[PDB]
Amino acid sequence: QLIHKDTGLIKEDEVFLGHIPLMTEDGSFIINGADRVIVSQIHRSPGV
Amino acid sequence: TPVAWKPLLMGVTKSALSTKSWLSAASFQNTTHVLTEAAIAGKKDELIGLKENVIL
Amino acid sequence: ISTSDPVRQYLHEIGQVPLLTLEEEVELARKVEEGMEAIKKLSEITGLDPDLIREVVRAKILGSARDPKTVEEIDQKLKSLPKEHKRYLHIAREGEAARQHLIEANLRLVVSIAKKYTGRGLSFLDLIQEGNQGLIRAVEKFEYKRRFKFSTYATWWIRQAINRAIADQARTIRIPVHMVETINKLSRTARQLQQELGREPTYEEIAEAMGPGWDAKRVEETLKIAQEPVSLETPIGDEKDSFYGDFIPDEHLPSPVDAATQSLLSEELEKALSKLSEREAMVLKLRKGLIDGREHTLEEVGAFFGVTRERIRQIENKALRKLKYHESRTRKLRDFLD
Amino acid sequence: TQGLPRVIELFEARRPKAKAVISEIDGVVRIEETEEKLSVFVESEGFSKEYKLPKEARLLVKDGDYVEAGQPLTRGAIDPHQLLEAKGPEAVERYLVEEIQKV
Amino acid sequence: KEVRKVRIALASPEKIRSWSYGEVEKPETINYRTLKPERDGLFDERIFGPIKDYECACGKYKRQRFEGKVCERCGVEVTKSIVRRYRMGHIELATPAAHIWFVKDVPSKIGTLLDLSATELEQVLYFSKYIVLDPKGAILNGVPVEKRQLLTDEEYRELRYGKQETYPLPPGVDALVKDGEEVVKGQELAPGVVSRLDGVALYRFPRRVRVEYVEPKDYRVQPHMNVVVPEGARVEAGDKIVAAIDPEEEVIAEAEGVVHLHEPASILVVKARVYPFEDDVEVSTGDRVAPGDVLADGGKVKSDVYGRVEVDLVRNVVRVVESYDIDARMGAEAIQQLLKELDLEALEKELLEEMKHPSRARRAKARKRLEVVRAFLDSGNRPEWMILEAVPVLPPDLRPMVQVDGGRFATSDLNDLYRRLINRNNRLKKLLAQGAPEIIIRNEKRMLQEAVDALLDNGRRGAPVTNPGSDRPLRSLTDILSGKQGRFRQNLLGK
Amino acid sequence: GKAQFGGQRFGEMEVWALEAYGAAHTLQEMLTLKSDDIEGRNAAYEAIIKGEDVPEPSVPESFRVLVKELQALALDVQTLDEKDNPVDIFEGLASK
Amino acid sequence: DQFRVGLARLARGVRERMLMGSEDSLTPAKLVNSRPLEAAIREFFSRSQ
DNA sequence: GCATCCGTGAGTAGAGAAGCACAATTTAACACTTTTGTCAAG
DNA sequence: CTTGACAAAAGTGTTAAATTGTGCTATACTGGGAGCCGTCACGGATGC
Ligand SMILES: [Zn+2]
């Protein structure tokens, strides 16, 4: 929604943001027709 | 009067980088440093060792 | 002020010139126009090139920090004029100096404009310098008589210079502006169709939205043209040890096999031509170019042996027939053509 | 100090982290241990050299022993450059070959 | 004969031009449609050679016996296409650029010769500080300027152009001082502001004009208006006082009177000497004069101080802003002149004297300089060759642009590095031709130096140059030769 | 790579092995005749298919690339003879 | 994380289109260009280690 | 003497986001003789 | 062996459309952007 703070008018529409790759049942992706796995990454946890 | 000198000891890396032939020194490490000093001095590699002749 | 960051260094330098007030802007703009008119008045009287005086006047304003003999000679020639004429030289000097200060005080305008064109193939400093070229042209074409602010007119020239430079310098293989804007329009049209369709538009759908004179064939050809070249140093794999150039074979230099079969063909042809006569073999060698490398026309061949054009055709064709007979009996040249 | 790193620092003529202390001249060592610090004096005919060894220094020489120039007063890896200036080219070459062989 | 020795030495600008078969003037590589090399580009056949053996670009010649012939139409030599692996081009730089190897390879060879530190060399080469070549009798802070002295931008502007500052006034007030009043430090120009420098104070834009006719009349001056007469001028009835775009707004005098300017927009205090004149002027705005130089009255009026002349056509006076014609320059061009004027034989003698100094550190430092000095003397190399005037261009076959079997083109990073240099060098030539201000020229020259550095050694100084759409640094000439993936260890020591 | 029908990599350590063996001519073939001596590799193949022994090898093309790339760095690299006279390894193809 | 990066790039392009003006007939579809978000997502699933 | 930032180096294979106006230059479609190429005459 | 004869094949001079290069838009707009640091020891210089 686009809001005009001065006028006070709201314009609402659904915009197409693209395509989200979908994970298959077994837990992989098909990227450009090729099966791919996103490997989990380990790193230092945030904090103090 | 003869030149008075004292012996020096350097590691293999420093000894290899101070060789007369600039081709073998440049092909080892510090290529920018080796070529910079060789070009200014106008060094002439006499192709004594093996690496120089391999390159050519 | 930054030894490392050039952008920060440039911003510091342009920050040392204060922004012009409206009164200061009008005064400088008036001087540039009066100086330009004064140079025109000087040239009509002194008789030399109007642009020649501008270079000489600008050289004095720029100073020794920026041919030297002819500039000084023209400078003395201008000063030899009477009092009324030397007045025009005075406005010319002040007009050129006002132009220098007017450009310097608007270097903040170009940076604000240029930062909106980043990520289009040119670095930020490249955008600023191109915008500076547009700013310089804006000063020359600006008219203060119209009472408009300088930034209103200058923004048009700063945007144009940056836009032109992107269309001319952002691609390794340069594409003309008329085709760059075609590519930009096609990309915009495809983007707008995607949001309406919820998917990648087809070439027919893009062509229909472009308008008359556009079909799917033209859209595909334009998109093929817009393809940027790929780097030979693009890494392959997780380690920077394999690159695209390592997998591209050279197809220009003949291979050792190709070079060898060329030599074998030459030695077989030279033995096949040995069975011919002396002049008869030389005719084929000169006709086909086996000596010089170019086909020699019948008239050129005829001049060498002192014969008419149709004479060669008799000996050239009869030599051809006998080589066919020899080949059928020996079978030594068939495999060299497949 | 052990294995491949020991070989590398010998071939690179690198100064050891826990370098030993060698006598610069020959003479007779004279130990003076106190509750505060340690100081070893190599007394000669007319020379009195000084070395301020730390408290936790494993000395390999006792009082009265005659030491040569370049001999290690304390245990540990000898700095090859110090040995060169103390005893000469032949000593350091002999030292380098033996130490590399030990590994 | 048999190859027995390989010699490496610096290449002079003359030697680089002797290598090149032509100057690469355009950043173009190939036509996008015909896929043929563009003229004067990085792949031009007239410079580097024909694409295919014994065939010119236009196609007039297609025979081997034309070997050694240059086509009159296309200008391409009829020879083997393999010359495109060997024939080099060159780029004629608008301004000299330093070779980054002789700048950043610690210790700097240029800095060692010139007795400049790494920081000092960086400031001069990349246009942060000026280095003095000829003081021309300049004095800074009471100390005369010396050769090789480093000047900041502010210090250079004070010496080159003078010292001045404008003091804005609060809206609606009047200045206490009058036009052309010799104010001093701390003297109040207006109730709310004081002059931070001593000099001559002059009104910039008088908002109100008071004419006392021979009865005062207060007018208003619009921001688009300009007063044509000075303060105290004798204006005859009807003469123009304040100019305007439209003649209706023109403020002409009703009768004869004296103009009194009031309500200045700001006061400009400039450290200048004013010489009133009555006759014509022998100089003009921008001229530089020394003490004793005649200014306007054919000898009667002469300058008594160093400065730059600005003639005033309304105040009828000549103001000489106290400044010096100091020759201080930035960039590699300043560094090149220092190495050109450096006498190696004299420097060697001076360094030998410093070798006798009892300090070990000074002897060690002098030995480092003498080793570089003796290297130039023994080899015959000329120290200013470390600054490039002509940039060699690698043969196109060693930086190929090839069409892959798929149809897309593949090219080396050097072409992008070369195009950036050509674009910046060509733009500097146009900026210089247009008489652009020094700030624009300085930025372009600094960009030119960085473009040269990226071509030779990308990432050595500053942020590495990357192609748009990726963070991958472009592979420079240094990167091609050095490292495990470099030419030595990947293609020469093993194959 | 097998997919590109490529040759085997004869790296520095393999070069070291031939040097330690004293196999100078075996080393020189791999450096020139079998890798990048364009004239040599063409003449080697032609000689072998004729039943002849391969000719004397010539300068590798990678050294020519090295010299040209060094010139691109504004470095004057020249091959000299016994008498210090310049020797052209480019067959007169790069001399104006 | 890569979705957020692309969305931040998309948000930046929305601001500049808001700076351009033409607010009389500005719609959210016109302000939003999804390509920066699609490119970041495509880059993650194709060229990420 | 010492402390610090910079620059150097760290195994080998293989296998993988502007638009328009107008001028200026180039391309391509024409016509044209011009020149081969040739097929019959002695 | 010449010498005519042909129909191309090739060269060539115009002319047109297609392509390419250049200039110009007048409310006012005047200092950026992305990073953002888990390795190690080694010289070598460069100044406190
Ligand atoms: Zn031609």
Interface of F with E in 27-86 (CB under 8 A): 30-31, 35-36, 59-66, 68-82, 84-85
Residue pair B16/B28 in contact by the 8 Å Cβ criterion: yes
Please list, in sequence order, all residues whose beta carbon lies within 8 angstroms of the beta carbon of residue C279, skipping any fewer than 6 positions away: C305, C315
In whole angstroms, give the CA distance from residue C243 to residue E162.
58
F43: β partners: none
Question: C115 Cβ partners below 8 Å, 6+ apart?
Answer: C124, C127
Q: Which nucleotide is nearest to C295 (CA to C1')?
A: H36
Under 8 Å between Cβ of C304 and C316: no
Q: How far is the CA of E55 from the centre of ligand 1 (A)?
A: 7
The values of phi and psi at residue E251, to 5°, are: -100, 95
In angstroms, the CA C153 to CA C170 distance is 26
The DSSP call for residue E85 is G
Instruction: Confirm or reject contact between B16 and chain E (CB < 8 A).
Output: no
Last residue of a domain, one of C147, C171, C195: C171
Letter for the amino acid at G15? R
According to DSSP, residue E84 is labeled G
DSSP E488: I
User: Quick one: C116 and C208 in the same domain?
Assistant: no
CA E224 to chain centroid, in Å, comes to: 35
Tokens at C145, concatenated: 């008589």
Q: Tell if C143 CB is < 7 Å from nucleic strand I.
A: yes
**CA–CA dist E442, E445 (Å, integer):** 5
In angstroms, this model's resolution equals 2.3
Amino acid at residue number F84? D
For residues E149-169, b (16+ Cβ closer than 10 Å) or e, as one string? bbbebebbbbbbebbbeebbb
H or E segment and range at residue C220: helix C216-225
Residues found in chain F? 96
CA dist C202 to C219, C221, E466, Å?
Answer: 10, 14, 33
The counts of H helices and E strands in chain G are 3, 0
Q: Which residues, numbered 1 to 48 in chain A, qualify as contacts with chain G under a Cβ-Cβ cut-off of 8 Å? A: 1-2, 4, 11-13, 15-21, 29, 31-32, 36, 38
Q: Which tokens sit at C279?
A: 């002049």
One domain, residues C311 and C199 = no
Q: Are F42 and C256 in contact (CB under 8 A)?
A: yes
Distance CA C301, CA C311 (A): 10
The Cβ-side half-sphere exposure at C250, using a 13 Å CA radius, reads 13
Was C80 annotated as part of a binding site?
A: yes
Q: What angle do CA E139, E145, E146 make, to 5 degrees?
A: 160
Residue in the block written with tokens 């595909």: C220
Is C322 within the bounds of a domain? yes
| Separation CA G1–CA G8 (nearest Å) | 11
Residue of D7, D11, D15 for testing the chain B interface, max B β-carbons within 10 Å: D11
- Considering the domain architecture, whether residues C192 and C283 belong to the same structural domain is answered as no
Q: How many residues does chain B have?
A: 56
Task: Locate breaks in chain G with C to N over 2.5 A; list the residue preceding each.
Answer: none
Strand partners, D19: D77
| Cα(E160)–Cα(E239) distance, integer angstroms | 39
Specify if C249 maps to a domain: no
Structure-token match 């998917």, residue found: C199
Domain harbouring C282, CATH code: 1.10.10.10
Q: Is residue C34 part of a domain?
A: yes
User: E143 in the Ramachandran plot: left (φ > 0), alpha (ψ -120 to 50) or beta?
Assistant: beta
Total structural domains in chain C? 3
Nucleotides of H under 7 A from a protein CB: 7-21, 27, 35-40
CA of E70 to the centre of ligand 1 (A): 7
Q: Which residue among C83, C179, C248 places its CB closest to the CB of E410?
A: C248
Is residue C45 located within the same domain as residue C191? no
Q: Rounded to whole angstroms, what are the CA distances from E86 to C124, E2, G29? A: 36, 20, 56
| Cα(E471)–Cα(G9) distance, integer angstroms | 17
Q: What is the pairing mode between strands E216-220 and E226-227?
A: unpaired
Whether C188 maps to a domain, the answer reads yes
Q: Is the dihedral of CA C5, C7, C13, C16 positive or negative?
A: negative
State the DSSP H helix or E strand holding residue E122, giving kind and residue range, or none if neither: helix E118-125
Are residues C196 and C128 part of one domain?
no
Chains D and E touch (3+ CB pairs under 8 A): no
Q: Is residue C246 part of a domain?
A: no
Ramachandran region, residue C73 (left: φ > 0; alpha: ψ -120 to 50; beta: rest): alpha
What is the rounded distance in angstroms from the CA atom of residue E2 to the CA atom of residue F81?
6
E481 touches B31 (CB < 8 A)? yes
Helix (H, G, I), strand (E, B) or coil at D37: coil
How many angstroms is it from C250 CA to the middle of ligand 1?
Answer: 26
- Is the minimum CB–CB distance between C244 and chain E shorter than 8 Å? yes
Q: Which of C129, C149, C171 is the last residue of a domain?
A: C171
CATH number, domain of C160, equals 1.20.120.1810
Among candidate residues E284, E7, E327, E349, the one with its CA nearest the CA of residue E135: E327
One domain for residues C117 and C95? yes
How many Å apart are C172 CA and I32 C1'?
26
Using CB atoms within 10 A of its CB, is residue D26 exposed (0-12), middle (13-18) or buried (19+)?
A: middle
| CA gap D17, E95 in Å, rounded | 52
Nucleotide nearest to E107 (CA to C1'): I45
Domain that holds residue D55: 20-76
Distance I22 C1' – C133 CA (angstroms): 15
Which pair of tokens denotes residue C302? 């005829």
Residues 6+ apart with CB under 8 A from E375: B37, B40, B41, B42, E381
Q: Which residue out of C242, C257, C266, C267 would a mutagenesis test of the F interface target, given it has the greatest number of F Cβ atoms within 10 Å?
A: C257
Task: Tell me whether F1 touches chain C (CB under 8 Å).
Answer: yes
Contacts of C165 (CB under 8 A, 6+ apart): C122, C126, C127, C130
- C195 reaches A (C-beta below 8 A): yes
Give the DSSP H/E element, type plus range, for residue E260.
strand E257-264
In terms of C-beta density within 10 A (0-12 exposed, 13-18 middle, 19 or more buried), how is residue E303 classed? buried
Task: Please give the nucleotide, over all strands, whose C1' is closest to the CA of residue E459.
Answer: H7
Upstream peptide bond of E464 is cis (omega within 30 degrees of 0): no
Contacts of C74 (CB under 8 A, 6+ apart): C48, C52, C53, C56
DSSP E strands, E62-205: 88-98, 130-134, 139-140, 143-144, 150-151, 164-168, 181-183, 199-203
Find and give the residue nearest to H27, measured CA to C1': E34
Q: Is C241 annotated as a binding residue?
A: yes
The answer to the question of residue C241 being in a domain is: no
**Are C204 and C270 in the same domain?**
no
Q: Which residues surround ligand 1, an ion (CB under 5 A)?
A: E 56, 58, 60, 71, 74
Residue E292 burial (10 A CB sphere; 0-12, 13-18, 19+): exposed
- Parent domain of C204: 175-228
* Same domain (yes/no): C66, C210: no
Q: Is the CATH code 2.40.50.100 the one for domain E270-323?
A: yes
Question: CA E194, CA E184: separation in Å to the nearest integer?
Answer: 10
N-terminal to C-terminal alpha carbon distance within chain B: 42
Which tokens belong to G30?
Answer: 């016109």
Q: Are E217 and E251 in contact (CB under 8 A)?
A: no
Interchain pair E376, B40: CB under 8 A: yes
Residue C242 lies in a domain: no
CA dihedral C128, C130, C133, C135 (to 10 degrees): -50
Q: Buried (b) or exposed (e) across E197-207, using 16+ Cβ within 10 A?
A: eebbbbbbbbb
Same domain, yes or no, for C196 and C125? Answer: no
CATH code at position D58: 2.40.50.100
Q: Which of C246, F2, C222, G43 is nearest to E410 (CA)?
A: C246
Q: Hey, what are E198's tokens?
A: 């001593």
Residue at C240 is within a domain: no
Cα–Cα distance, E42 to E57 (Å, whole number) = 15
